[PDB]
Amino acid sequence: KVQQRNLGVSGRIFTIESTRVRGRTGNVLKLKVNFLPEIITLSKEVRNLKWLGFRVPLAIVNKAHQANQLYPFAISLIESVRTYERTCEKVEERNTISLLVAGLKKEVQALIAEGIALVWESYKLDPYVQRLAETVFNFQEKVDDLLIIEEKIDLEVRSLETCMYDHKTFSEILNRVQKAVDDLNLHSYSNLPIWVNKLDMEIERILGVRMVVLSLPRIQSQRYQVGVHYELTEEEKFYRNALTRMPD
Amino acid sequence: VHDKELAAEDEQVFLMKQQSLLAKQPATPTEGVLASFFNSLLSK
Amino acid sequence: EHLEQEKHELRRRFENREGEWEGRVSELETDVKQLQDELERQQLHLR
Amino acid sequence: EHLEQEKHELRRRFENREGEWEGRVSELETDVKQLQDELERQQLHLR
Amino acid sequence: DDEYEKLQVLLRDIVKRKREENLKMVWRINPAHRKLQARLDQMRKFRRQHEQLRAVIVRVLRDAADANAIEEVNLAYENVKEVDGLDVSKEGTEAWEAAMKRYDERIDRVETRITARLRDQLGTAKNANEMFRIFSRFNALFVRPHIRGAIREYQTQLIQRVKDDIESLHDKFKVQYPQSQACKMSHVRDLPPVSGSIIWAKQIDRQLTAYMKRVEDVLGKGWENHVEGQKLKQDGDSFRMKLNTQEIFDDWAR
């Protein structure tokens, strides 16, 4: 069976494959590594059978050695690609955070494209994979953070509808979500002004459903850009416009 | 001026795009201002 | 860049040849082991 | 020049180890051939 | 080694050619100087470690206990020095091994004394600044592995204090520069507002670098990969990127 298969490793490291998934009419394209698990099983069988007196043919042992040469890069590529796929799935789970991972996903896709042109025989594989792995890990970590704090923001939003009508509670809740937005800014998430002004409209709508409100300071977009000489009016500093957002 | 909304492409369209570029990829084997002063002196 | 590629090719060729020779020496050693074992059994059978 | 002399060093090491393995395989081949012919001699002598 | 390899290539070529004249293929070589090579390697490895330890002690332990430890280390070197290191004979090898064992146990005793002093650190120190300065002064001494492993519970305390301080820096930087008293007092002291903002950003950058150096001192070298120093390094990098001032100068010049 092994001689019939005649497995080997060559060519480009990445491949694009079709996979039919129930519920979607279109065939899902996926990025697989050019290293099939059957080669790993072949190497495992070759190295396990040797000590039982089972004389394996020399060509199969040579091919197992060739596969084992590149196995350290292949396993890292496999796990990096799987982590990228799970990161994409996590992003797809929540559609309210897609714009906040534009740069990270773009650079990861750029690295993936750079690696598609790469081949096993090239000498760029050794650093690149490590770089790719690091990038993917950072992406995952970012997305992980981008999930948790965002959920907290949502929780705080849903806590403001039922928030007690007293200035101290409103002030500390808006301070908490402002600190959350500042933390978003610190970790360099793209399109923060878009997401935060959307949150500003949403919380202004909530306050419209709800002087105490008008004295509440607004949620600043980027509280860290200091020294750039720009001014914000009282309307942009507080929810003075909440009087204009009544539903009744 | 509010920044343009940058966004990465979809994974499906991105992979289709990468396949298209792989197909299209053939199988490979494996000063004047300084001069202006100089021009004037030569004429004089 | 071209010389880096060539150095990588020569390095991997050296490792491939080392692995092939290691396998050849291993199988030759096992051939000697089984041959001498059979010789010992047959020498005992002579007596 | 560092890459070039690294390549030449790799070539020299490759040739030297190839010669070592060639010698080892040749002596092993001679040993198994001698043991095979002596084993056949003792087998036909036994009967 | 290189010349012997080059000769061995030629000899293998001759044996392959003149196979009839050379009947066997025995190639074992046991040069007499390899024992001296191993002895010299061992002596070099011992001496570099001892010089590292002695220089560190002379710097950071510059109390009669300090002088006691110093003469203990010097006596260890002297006692190793009495054994003839060049003698590669079996009596010489045994003497060398005994000297190494004696030196190792004496150095371990000195290490225990140093750890006792690093407990006297808390036996004397009261506030966090004093023990910060103590780690700063004793910084090289934690390069040793046993010394580094001795101090484990205080590193977390000082790392949390540095996290509190960099949090305070973050909170200060959240307040915009015109909204801060820095702008008012800079105008009062004749400093122009753009240069005042530049100075404010530069001072925040300087304090960030100082706290990063404090973290390096507390955790020792390789702090970027530490379990607690990874987040600190990431926050420092992002905050330093945000502190870039070139945009202000470009805008003012324009």
Side-chain angles (χ1 to χ4, degrees), chain A, chain B residues 1-30 32 35, chain C, chain D, chain E:
Chain A
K1 281 168 185 172
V2 167
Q3 281 170 359
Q4 219 74 322
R5 291 254 55 78
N6 210 337
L7 297 166
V9 289
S10 59
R12 309 220 197 79
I13 61 171
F14 284 120
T15 312
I16 300 158
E17 281 169 22
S18 177
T19 316
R20 278 197 172 181
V21 180
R22 289 187 199 188
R24 272 189 179 171
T25 188
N27 308 325
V28 174
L29 298 177
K30 277 195 191 211
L31 174 85
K32 304 332 191 323
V33 192
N34 189 342
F35 202 79
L36 305 165
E38 58 206 273
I39 296 146
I40 286 154
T41 65
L42 169 156
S43 179
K44 278 150 170 197
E45 300 258 20
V46 164
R47 68 191 269 289
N48 278 294
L49 287 162
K50 271 284 193 191
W51 66 269
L52 292 159
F54 282 51
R55 294 182 99 270
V56 187
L58 198 71
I60 310 310
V61 178
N62 297 335
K63 293 290 181 105
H65 163 56
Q66 291 311 118
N68 219 328
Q69 278 180 350
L70 295 159
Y71 179 57
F73 308 136
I75 184 151
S76 186
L77 279 156
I78 286 278
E79 190 156 350
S80 296
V81 169
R82 199 202 291 176
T83 311
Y84 171 60
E85 288 171 350
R86 185 56 178 167
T87 311
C88 282
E89 288 174 358
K90 276 177 165 193
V91 167
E92 194 265 306
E93 191 213 19
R94 297 212 154 80
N95 287 297
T96 60
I97 54 166
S98 183
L99 73 164
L100 282 159
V101 288
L104 300 163
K105 203 184 269 161
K106 186 154 268 158
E107 89 193 289
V108 167
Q109 282 171 16
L111 267 166
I112 285 153
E114 199 262 307
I116 283 163
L118 190 57
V119 302
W120 295 101
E121 205 174 357
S122 282
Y123 73 101
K124 324 305 298 213
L125 189 70
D126 177 43
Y128 158 71
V129 168
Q130 170 60 286
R131 200 200 307 155
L132 186 74
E134 171 48 59
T135 315
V136 167
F137 171 64
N138 169 44
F139 188 14
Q140 193 205 340
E141 271 281 80
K142 287 278 152 278
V143 168
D144 297 325
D145 291 316
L146 173 55
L147 285 154
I148 289 280
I149 193 58
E150 195 252 323
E151 281 165 87
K152 178 55 69 196
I153 284 159
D154 269 27
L155 173 139
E156 290 289 334
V157 169
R158 314 323 307 276
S159 82
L160 202 140
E161 276 275 328
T162 60
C163 167
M164 298 179 15
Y165 211 84
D166 42 352
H167 203 281
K168 58 186 146 302
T169 55
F170 273 109
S171 70
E172 62 91 13
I173 288 160
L174 61 89
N175 164 260
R176 290 164 189 226
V177 47
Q178 180 59 90
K179 281 167 171 152
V181 167
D182 292 331
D183 300 3
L184 269 284
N185 203 30
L186 267 164
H187 306 120
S188 73
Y189 292 114
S190 61
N191 297 303
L192 178 62
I194 295 149
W195 193 85
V196 76
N197 63 48
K198 285 178 182 188
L199 172 83
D200 158 49
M201 311 285 178
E202 203 276 351
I203 194 172
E204 202 186 63
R205 182 199 62 76
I206 288 167
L207 290 162
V209 200
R210 297 296 308 282
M211 42 193 78
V212 169
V213 168
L214 312 182
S215 64
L216 297 187
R218 217 172 199 83
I219 301 304
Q220 305 301 318
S221 169
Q222 300 167 323
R223 208 160 158 74
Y224 275 70
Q225 51 183 359
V226 177
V228 303
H229 306 115
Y230 303 112
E231 321 186 30
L232 303 161
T233 68
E234 212 73 2
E235 284 77 31
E236 280 85 336
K237 263 186 196 76
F238 303 86
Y239 299 108
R240 307 204 85 74
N241 296 319
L243 184 62
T244 74
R245 312 303 196 194
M246 68 156 188
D248 297 333
Chain B
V1 174
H2 198 191
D3 193 68
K4 187 209 150 289
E5 199 278 341
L6 73 162
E9 300 90 333
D10 207 291
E11 301 94 331
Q12 283 275 101
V13 71
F14 166 61
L15 278 159
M16 162 55 218
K17 188 182 310 173
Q18 287 295 313
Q19 190 70 281
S20 177
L21 285 286
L22 281 181
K24 290 185 196 105
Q25 184 268 8
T28 47
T30 309
Chain C
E1 292 167 326
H2 214 77
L3 274 173
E4 290 273 35
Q5 282 286 350
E6 297 156 80
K7 177 170 61 57
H8 199 52
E9 301 325 320
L10 267 72
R11 195 174 288 278
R12 64 152 70 263
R13 278 150 67 88
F14 172 54
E15 267 96 11
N16 300 355
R17 212 65 51 85
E18 172 48 57
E20 285 192 338
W21 287 124
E22 169 50 36
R24 272 197 64 76
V25 169
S26 180
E27 58 82 19
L28 274 159
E29 189 273 299
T30 59
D31 288 14
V32 182
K33 142 213 80 173
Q34 53 98 29
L35 270 158
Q36 73 182 358
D37 281 304
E38 282 282 81
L39 185 82
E40 288 292 323
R41 302 293 77 60
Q42 187 252 332
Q43 175 51 74
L44 273 159
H45 266 275
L46 190 141
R47 293 261 64 78
Chain D
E1 188 264 303
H2 293 350
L3 265 70
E4 179 153 303
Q5 63 91 29
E6 278 177 340
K7 195 191 194 194
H8 269 77
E9 279 187 87
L10 285 156
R11 204 197 326 278
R12 202 269 302 279
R13 290 194 222 90
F14 172 52
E15 299 156 81
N16 160 50
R17 214 66 48 80
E18 201 152 25
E20 291 167 54
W21 292 126
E22 280 290 341
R24 182 142 286 192
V25 165
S26 56
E27 63 160 27
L28 284 159
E29 267 168 33
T30 279
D31 291 345
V32 297
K33 192 247 191 194
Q34 166 264 293
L35 189 56
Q36 174 64 231
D37 63 54
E38 182 175 40
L39 182 66
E40 194 205 349
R41 193 268 297 168
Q42 211 194 348
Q43 202 204 44
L44 57 93
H45 162 265
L46 186 136
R47 192 61 45 79
Chain E
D1 285 29
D2 170 2
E3 301 277 43
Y4 179 72
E5 263 182 349
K6 285 208 300 303
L7 185 70
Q8 202 177 15
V9 169
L10 166 69
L11 297 174
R12 284 217 160 83
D13 178 33
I14 293 163
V15 166
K16 190 196 148 295
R17 198 81 62 84
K18 316 182 187 177
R19 180 77 201 92
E20 66 285 14
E21 320 198 354
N22 277 262
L23 312 192
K24 288 311 306 297
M25 292 136 279
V26 170
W27 285 104
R28 177 62 215 195
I29 188 55
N30 217 323
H33 80 285
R34 285 280 179 78
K35 291 169 63 53
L36 187 64
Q37 177 169 2
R39 184 62 158 275
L40 281 173
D41 183 23
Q42 286 188 4
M43 166 155 87
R44 191 185 200 191
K45 201 183 277 189
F46 156 79
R47 274 213 78 178
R48 78 190 281 280
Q49 295 289 122
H50 179 86
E51 187 64 53
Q52 152 181 328
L53 184 140
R54 200 217 78 218
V56 165
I57 285 170
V58 166
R59 287 301 311 277
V60 302
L61 276 295
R62 196 178 267 168
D63 213 317
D66 304 335
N68 184 192
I70 288 156
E71 53 62 17
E72 278 281 310
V73 168
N74 293 330
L75 270 167
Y77 186 62
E78 193 195 347
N79 285 333
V80 153
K81 176 159 175 208
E82 318 293 15
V83 167
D84 191 18
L86 298 173
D87 189 2
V88 292
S89 62
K90 294 290 106 175
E91 46 263 29
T93 312
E94 271 166 5
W96 186 260
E97 286 282 353
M100 291 325 88
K101 176 54 53 169
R102 273 140 50 80
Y103 171 80
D104 283 322
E105 60 179 31
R106 199 193 264 248
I107 290 295
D108 285 14
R109 264 180 278 284
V110 171
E111 190 270 330
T112 49
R113 291 185 71 207
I114 284 154
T115 317
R117 296 285 154 197
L118 263 60
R119 294 280 162 283
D120 277 28
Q121 165 207 110
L122 279 95
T124 47
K126 50 200 80 85
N127 316 306
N129 287 314
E130 283 74 359
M131 85 197 283
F132 264 115
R133 279 281 158 82
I134 288 153
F135 283 170
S136 160
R137 175 161 59 121
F138 281 51
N139 174 40
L141 200 52
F142 313 110
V143 171
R144 310 290 287 157
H146 285 190
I147 303 303
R148 208 198 324 104
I151 303 301
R152 180 62 182 79
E153 70 209 337
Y154 320 127
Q155 277 168 357
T156 61
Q157 298 177 28
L158 311 173
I159 286 282
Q160 199 71 354
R161 190 176 180 282
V162 171
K163 279 215 83 188
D164 162 78
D165 289 354
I166 199 174
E167 191 86 40
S168 305
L169 265 294
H170 288 318
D171 285 345
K172 161 151 313 174
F173 199 58
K174 283 176 214 302
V175 172
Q176 288 284 349
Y177 168 67
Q179 283 69 349
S180 68
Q181 305 270 55
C183 175
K184 185 172 73 178
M185 270 316 87
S186 78
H187 175 55
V188 162
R189 297 201 169 282
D190 209 65
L191 196 68
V194 178
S195 88
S197 82
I198 294 155
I199 290 283
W200 204 59
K202 285 251 182 166
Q203 292 315 307
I204 296 297
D205 202 274
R206 195 149 283 103
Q207 296 294 112
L208 180 69
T209 296
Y211 285 122
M212 281 294 93
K213 183 52 64 79
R214 272 186 170 170
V215 152
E216 165 165 14
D217 165 46
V218 166
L219 303 177
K221 282 280 174 77
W223 65 274
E224 286 82 350
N225 294 301
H226 200 257
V227 284
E228 297 171 350
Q230 273 169 353
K231 201 196 277 179
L232 269 292
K233 177 57 174 179
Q234 214 179 69
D235 292 3
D237 180 271
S238 69
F239 193 59
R240 202 162 287 163
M241 161 46 48
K242 284 175 165 204
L243 280 159
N244 200 4
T245 291
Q246 183 60 31
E247 314 314 306
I248 308 176
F249 170 90
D250 295 335
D251 182 79
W252 162 84
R254 214 64 46 78

